[PDB]
Design a protein around this ligand. Structure first.
Ligand SMILES: [Mg+2]
Ligand SMILES: [Zn+2]
Ligand SMILES: [Zn+2]
Lengths: 77, 41, 1344, 50
């Protein structure tokens, strides 16, 4: 979260993996125009991504599944 | 004796020092021979 | 665009023409009125591109209709301007010219190919003598130097078959004609017959050059230039300065003179000049080319117009200020600022105060973007005008921008990775940056004029890794050792000390309080004091078996201050933490406990609250410093007068001649030292515990509340020595260099020094100050070398699966335990578990991380030696596995895959460098009680019943009741003992006795003594004494031995009445005690010697600083190395040659005899045939690491280097984990040398990477075939770093020209593995965050 | 001992030795060596101990 990022690291493992995952999710939020899962509370996209990861919503597996589903649906139409 | 004097100026002066000057007679001698060669050709 | 590798090779002339766009024929640059460029000059627009974008000189072909079309009339192509930065030209030399790099850069590759001494090529090139290319007729041969007249002599006779030339044409003709295959095979054969070591190695290196030179596809002809390339104009600009003048680079000048000489040479040849003139021109052309390529290496540097040498291409690459270090490895940066720092005590640990103006400037484009988003500005120019006039909406937008955006704060020099940290900004007014007090220690910053630099991370990934990896709340432990770095300091410590301490009866004795809240309500109302001793009811919490917090309530005895402090402490910790007067150590331990019990977040909040409370109560204490606070003992002058009178009497006694100079000097120094100690102790006694208080009645005695004493105890700022100087005596001083002045300084700073004493102290002051000033540079250079050696290390695997390790024991140097296990094994992985069924039933499971709990288990079971997995033994290629490393000290767990170990190790070792500086040997005395256990001891009983030792290496220990070693000692050879093995010795007892200034040959038996092969006059000298008439026999050595008595080897026969010697049981050795030279037997021949008596008396009569560690890591050879025993067996002397001591070791079982030359004046420890093993020491002196590695093995050299580096740091109280030194040693054992014919393409004497050999060997052993045999080499830091498999890394490090030449000749290929390589080429490093990226590219190698 | 190691024999050879040490690579004529030594240490305008 805002102060310390300990819980997210504990949730994912590597710090480096955390950085990469949260970066791609934040890019998604910023420019891809998606809707944050957790409330805004007037936060940058970076901290919103970290709070999403913190409580188990966003993770590399989930992001991959979501993107594959979107691509499948897009190609269907 | 050459102390590996890499200075090109030294090499030039050493090479040019050998040939010795000669005046008032040679110049006439060489000029005559030059003109003789030109006349021959 | 995308690439994979970089390769280097020589350039063929047709290649150089391939690069070119046209050739440069005139030396003109630009026109003097209209500054347009000239037709074929150095700046032509036709060949190097157009000056102004999309516009040729005439402009007939314009308006982007013609793209790439050349306008014919002006010759100017219509394209972009950037091409002037990348198009090249060329120059066609009239005479071939040698390339200086391949001629002078030693070992002179041209010399190696042709096998000619350098001076011969020199004499040929400078037109001083001829050389024979081809003698078909048998008279002459190839590469024979011919003098001037000698060529005339050979031509006039022979002629028409005689090819001799002179100058660079000759050298090129020699290289062009020489066929590589022939010499390759011939030298291959030649090594097969005779190997003279020097000849053998020179042939190996020449064969290496030829084989590589054939492989690479280069041809030797290309070492000599015929076409020369010309660098693009915009990299050597000619620009107009504002004042009307012009500024130019030097390459313009050098190119101009090359072109001038070349043009005039063409003119001369066209004109048919005499030969001396053309020879002159040819030399000057060659010199001009040499000065172009590398100035000053040809001896005399061409100076510019001014005074100074012109700077050439090689100069643009090489130095500290060349491209490599100054523009590629580190460069100036946008989005950055700089200013003075100041303390902000109200901040939270993750914040920094940023001035409004700096913030407005740094975040400019972000502000433009959000001004446009909200519609407040239509266009960017409107946004500019909005910002420059600073409207209020701009400040609102800025406040919205910086929120959640971290910035990076840096303070140079950046010694370790904590010198850069990321903070969250708070906008302030003013112009100074506000820094949180707790992070000053990490930065090494003090607020007296320092400055720091601010950088802005831009992308989302940069922001995230500033928040996750770099944020200040993530760095609380140091990566060098595990201890925390957030450590409260001066004012915080003073406040907490004052708040906690207790006092006698003062207000509010013996009240009873319902918890801390009442304590605060009492103190702040003036009803009680912070120091009252009160009884308070307190509820602690304690973490349960499954993490639950059980609550326990009790009634404790404490003070008001401690009760108030308790309100801060997070729940989970015991009350005992707060219940004593806190110093610095106590506070740091409090934080450490909170960390290892509760986690990270509670410790962060707790650290803040400690800081806030410490400031508040330090201020309320009102501690100050007056001059009355430095008390002086009432009896100082008495001590001084007594010492003065006593020294006066010793000096008076000197003139009686009873005392020499050395005696008097030493005595006086001892006297003054004793007086100093008495004065200091009296001062501390008067100061420390001087307060007498009434305890409701009679008197009481307590520690004092003197302010300077408070600053001493609390550990806030003072120390004992400083206070000694303030109130005692200043002490003794030293003359400029070594000598310590006789009369000390009796005055102190309160009393004031006088003129002479001040002048005396100035010496030491200036010496120390200059030391620091000139020590910083050495520290920096050392750390740079260390960083460059070990950068490629990254954690790559999870488990190499190796079974090796290092056995580790606590260090028991001398008498006392320097280091226990728990400091030395914590956080490492145990390999090949040590079990002890029996006394302790020791169970250590495989491959476990040693937590604190496991260490506690080890302590209570009290085990001493543990084998531990270590980096130097890891089996992974191109990296180390996580398990062989251990903890990540900064974080606290098993280390993550992909982290850059090598840089961390180098930084952690090099960081403390700045603070690092620059005989009663009679017997052996045990300190504490215990039991004796000897090891490797050869004992012999004498008649006195005393154990005499003859073993060379005898070690003394002290086993305690629980079975640990508490002491260790080295028993010298021939030392008499006191007690045997097994019995318990007593504290203070002496166990051994020997003669210090003597090595005696001790007797074992009795009987008659026969003096054999020793004659008087030939071998010994007659010595006559006075009336008593006691004579002594002294054996003369072969140095002064006469020629007739040379074969006489002195010896002592031990015979009985019959002469027959009884043989030792079971052993067949003859009793032939051949004592070596100078066996001084005072007793004459035929004297009964008792067992245990002295036969001979041969007497036996340290940098330690930053240079010491620099020499340890550089693997330098000590001047006087100890010699080691190579092969076990029998030892003897042999036949001396010119005095060459001849040492012959014939093995007991091995057949081959091994001979060693020995220096004449060096002594030998061993006498004759002994049982000496691998690397048994035989001489005395410093030991060389190379020998350690060759003989004892790799673990031995690692242990040696670790120990002797760590001594230097321990002596200064600097704690570094051994793991980092192990890493550096690993990187320092990289190469191996091959001694075998294997199955692969290797050779005798080649040096190749140990990993490469492992790969080839395992590959062949998967196929049955036998691989080659190798032996590892140990190389210094600089060597090992210069010998990597990558010319970019080595070239950026040091010695650029040499490594570029070797790489160019050998046709190397760089595959871009390291970190420096990717940094230079502008890519993601293969470590940390970037790691994953490269591994993807790795699997792309599968699909290619 | 220095005399025994000393290779030169007379004055002129000594001047030649000095001359070819100071200016290597030039023929050591009589007058050149003489002038070099004099100007080297004993000439008013080329040496001054103030
Ligand atoms: Mg300062
Ligand atoms: Zn045109
Ligand atoms: Zn390993």
């Amino acid at each position: 979260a805002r102060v310390t990022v300990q819980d997210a690291v504990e949730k994912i493992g590597n710090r480096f993996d955390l950085v990469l995952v949260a970066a791609r999710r934040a890019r998604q939020m910023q420019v891809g125009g998606k809707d944050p899962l957790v409330p805004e509370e007037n936060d940058k996209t970076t901290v919103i991504a970290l709070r999403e990861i913190e409580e188990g919503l966003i993770n590399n597996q989930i992001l991959d599944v979501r993107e594959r589903q979107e691509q499948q649906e897009q190609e269907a139409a | 004796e050459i102390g590996r004097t890499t200075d090109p100026v030294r090499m030039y002066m050493r090479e040019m020092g050998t040939v010795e000057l000669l005046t008032r007679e040679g110049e006439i001698d060489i000029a005559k021979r030059i003109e003789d060669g030109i006349n021959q050709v | 665009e995308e690439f994979d590798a970089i390769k280097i090779a020589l350039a063929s002339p047709d290649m150089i023409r391939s690069w070119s766009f046209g050739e440069v024929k005139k030396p003109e640059t630009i026109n003097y009125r209209t500054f347009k460029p000239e037709r074929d000059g150095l700046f032509c627009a036709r060949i190097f591109g157009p000056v102004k974008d999309y516009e040729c000189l005439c402009g007939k072909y314009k308006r982007l209709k013609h793209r790439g079309v050349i306008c014919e009339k002006c010759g100017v192509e219509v394209t972009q301007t950037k091409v002037r930065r990348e198009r090249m030209g060329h120059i066609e030399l009239a005479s071939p010219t040698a390339h200086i790099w391949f001629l002078k850069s030693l070992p002179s590759r041209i010399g190696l190919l042709l096998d000619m001494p350098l001076r011969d090529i020199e004499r040929v090139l400078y037109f001083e003598s001829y050389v024979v290319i081809e003698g078909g007729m048998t008279n002459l041969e190839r590469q024979q130097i011919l003098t001037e007249e000698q060529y005339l002599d050979a031509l006039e006779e022979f002629g028409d078959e005689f090819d001799a030339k002179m100058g660079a044409e000759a050298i090129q003709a020699l290289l062009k004609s020489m066929d590589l295959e022939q010499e390759c095979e011939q030298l291959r054969e030649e090594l097969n017959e005779t190997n003279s070591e020097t000849k053998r190695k020179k042939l190996t290196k020449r064969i290496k050059l030829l084989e590589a030179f054939v492989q690479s596809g280069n041809k030797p002809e290309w070492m000599i230039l015929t076409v020369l390339p010309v660098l693009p104009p915009d990299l050597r600009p000619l620009v107009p300065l504002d004042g009307g003048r012009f500024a130019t680079s030097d390459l313009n000048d050098l190119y101009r003179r090359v072109i001038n000489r070349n043009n005039r040479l063409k003119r001369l040849l066209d004109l048919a000049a005499p030969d001396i003139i053309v020879r002159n021109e040819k030399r000057m052309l060659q010199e001009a080319v040499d000065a172009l390529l590398d100035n000053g290496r040809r001896g005399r540097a061409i100076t510019g117009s001014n005074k100074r040498p012109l700077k050439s291409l090689a100069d643009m690459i090489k130095g500290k200020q060349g491209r490599f270090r100054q523009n590629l490895l580190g460069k100036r940066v946008d989005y950055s600022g700089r200013s003075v720092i100041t303390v902000g005590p109200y901040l939270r640990l993750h914040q920094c105060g940023l001035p409004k103006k700096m913030a407005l400037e740094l975040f400019k484009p972000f502000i433009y973007g959000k001004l446009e988003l909200r519609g407040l500005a239509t266009t960017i120019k409107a946004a500019k005008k909005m910002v420059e006039r600073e409207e209020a909406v701009v400040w609102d937008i800025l406040d919205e921008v910086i929120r959640e955006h971290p910035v990076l704060l840096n303070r140079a020099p950046t010694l370790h990775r904590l010198g850069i940290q990321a903070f969250e900004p708070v906008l302030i007014e003013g112009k100074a940056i506000q820094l949180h007090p707790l992070v000053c220690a990490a930065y090494n910053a003090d607020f007296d004029g320092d400055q720091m630099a601010v950088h802005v991370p831009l992308t989302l990934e940069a922001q995230l890794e500033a928040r996750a990896l770099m944020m200040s709340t993530n760095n609380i432990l140091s990566p060098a050792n595990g201890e925390p770095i957030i450590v409260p300091s001066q004012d915080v410590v003073l406040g907490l000390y004052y708040m906690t301490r207790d006092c006698v009866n003062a207000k509010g004795e013996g009240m009873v309080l319902t918890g801390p809240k009442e304590a605060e309500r009492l103190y702040r109302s003036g009803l009680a004091s912070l120091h009252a001793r009160v009884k308070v009811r307190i509820t602690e919490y304690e973490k349960d078996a499954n993490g639950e917090l059980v609550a326990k309530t009790s009634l404790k005895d404490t003070t008001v201050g401690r009760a108030i402090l308790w309100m801060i402490v997070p729940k989970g910790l015991p009350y005992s933490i707060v219940n004593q007067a806190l110093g610095k150590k106590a506070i740091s331990k409090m934080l450490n406990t909170c960390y290892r019990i509760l986690g990270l977040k509670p410790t962060v909040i707790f650290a803040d609250q400690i800081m806030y409370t410490g400031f508040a109560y330090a201020a309320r204490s009102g501690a100050s410093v007056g001059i009355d606070d430095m008390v002086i003992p009432e009896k100082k002058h008495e001590i001084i007068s007594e010492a003065e009178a006593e020294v006066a009497e010793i000096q008076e006694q000197f003139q009686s001649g009873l005392v020499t100079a050395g005696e008097r000097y030493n005595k006086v120094i001892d006297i003054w030292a004793a007086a100093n100690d008495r004065v200091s102790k009296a001062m501390m006694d008067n100061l420390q515990t001087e307060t007498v208080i009434n305890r409701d009645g009679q008197e009481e005695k307590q520690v004092s509340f003197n302010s300077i004493y408070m600053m001493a105890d609390s550990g806030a700022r003072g120390s004992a020595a400083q206070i000694r100087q303030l109130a005692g005596m200043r002490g003794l001083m030293a003359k400029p260099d070594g000598s310590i002045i006789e009369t000390p300084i009796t005055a102190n700073f309160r009393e004031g020094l006088n003129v002479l004493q001040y002048f005396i102290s100035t010496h030491g002051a200036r010496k120390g100050l200059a030391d620091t000033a000139l020590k910083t540079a050495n520290s920096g250079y050392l750390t740079r070398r260390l960083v460059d050696v070990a950068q490629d290390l990254v954690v790559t695997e999870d488990d190499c699966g190796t079974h090796e390790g290092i056995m580790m024991t606590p260090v028991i140097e001398g008498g006392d335990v320097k280091e226990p296990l728990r400091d030395r094994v914590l956080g490492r992985v145990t390999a090949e578990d040590v079990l002890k069924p029996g006394t302790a039933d020791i169970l250590v499971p495989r491959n476990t991380l040693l937590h604190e709990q496991w260490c506690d288990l080890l302590e209570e079971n009290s085990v001493d030696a543990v084998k531990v997995r270590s980096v130097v033994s890891c089996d992974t290629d191109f990296g180390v596995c996580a398990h062989c490393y251990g903890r990540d000290l900064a974080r606290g767990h098993i280390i993550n895959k992909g982290e850059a170990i090598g840089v961390i190790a180098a930084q952690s070792i090099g960081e403390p460098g700045t603070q690092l500086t620059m005989a009663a040997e009679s017997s052996i005395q045990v300190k504490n009680k215990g039991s004796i256990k000897l090891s490797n001891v050869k004992s012999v009983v004498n008649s006195s019943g005393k154990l005499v030792i003859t073993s060379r290496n005898t070690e003394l220990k002290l086993i305690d009741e629980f079975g640990r070693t508490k002491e260790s000692y080295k028993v010298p050879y021939g030392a008499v003992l006191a007690k045997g093995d097994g019995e318990q010795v007593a504290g203070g007892e002496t166990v051994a006795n020997w003669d210090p200034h003597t090595m005696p040959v001790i007797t074992e038996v009795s009987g008659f003594v026969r003096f054999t092969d020793m004659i008087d006059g030939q071998t010994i000298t007659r010595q006559t004494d006075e009336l008593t008439g006691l004579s002594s026999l002294v054996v003369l050595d072969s140095a002064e031995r006469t020629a007739g008595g040379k074969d006489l080897r002195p010896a002592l026969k031990i015979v009985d009445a019959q002469g027959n010697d009884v043989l030792i049981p079971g052993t067949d050795m003859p009793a032939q005690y051949f004592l070596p030279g100078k066996a001084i037997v005072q007793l004459e021949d035929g004297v009964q010697i008792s067992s245990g008596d002295t036969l001979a008396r041969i007497p036996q009569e340290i940098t330690g600083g930053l240079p010491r560690v620099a020499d340890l890591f550089e693997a330098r050879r000590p001047k006087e190395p100890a010699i080691l025993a190579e092969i076990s067996g029998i030892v003897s002397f042999g036949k001396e040659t010119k005095g060459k001591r001849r040492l012959v070791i014939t093995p007991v079982d091995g057949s081959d005899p091994y001979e060693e030359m020995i220096p004449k004046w060096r002594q030998l420890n061993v006498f004759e045939g002994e049982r000496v093993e691998r690397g048994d020491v035989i001489s005395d002196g410093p030991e060389a690491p190379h020998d350690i590695l060759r003989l004892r093995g790799v673990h031995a050299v690692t242990r040696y280097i670790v120990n002797e580096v760590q001594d230097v740091y321990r002596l200064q109280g600097v704690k570094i984990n051994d793991k980092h030194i192990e890493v550096i040693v690993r990187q320092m054992l990289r190469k191996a040398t091959i001694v075998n014919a294997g199955s692969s393409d290797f050779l005798e004497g080649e040096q190749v990477e140990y990993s490469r050999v492992k790969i080839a060997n395992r590959e062949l052993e998967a196929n049955g075939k036998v691989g080659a045999t190798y032996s590892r080499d140990l190389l210094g830091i600089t060597k090992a770093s210069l010998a990597t498999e990558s010319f970019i890394s080595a070239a950026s490090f040091q010695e650029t020209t040499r490594v570029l030449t070797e790489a160019a000749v050998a046709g190397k290929r760089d595959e871009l593995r390291g970190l420096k390589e990717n940094v230079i080429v502008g890519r993601l490093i293969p470590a940390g965050t970037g790691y994953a990226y490269h591994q993807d590219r790795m699997r792309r190698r599968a699909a290619g | 001992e220095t005399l025994r190691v000393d290779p030169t024999n007379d004055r002129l050879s000594a001047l030649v030795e000095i001359y070819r040490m100071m200016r290597p690579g030039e023929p050591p004529t009589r007058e050149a060596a003489e002038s070099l030594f004099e100007n080297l240490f004993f000439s008013e305008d080329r040496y001054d101990l103030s």
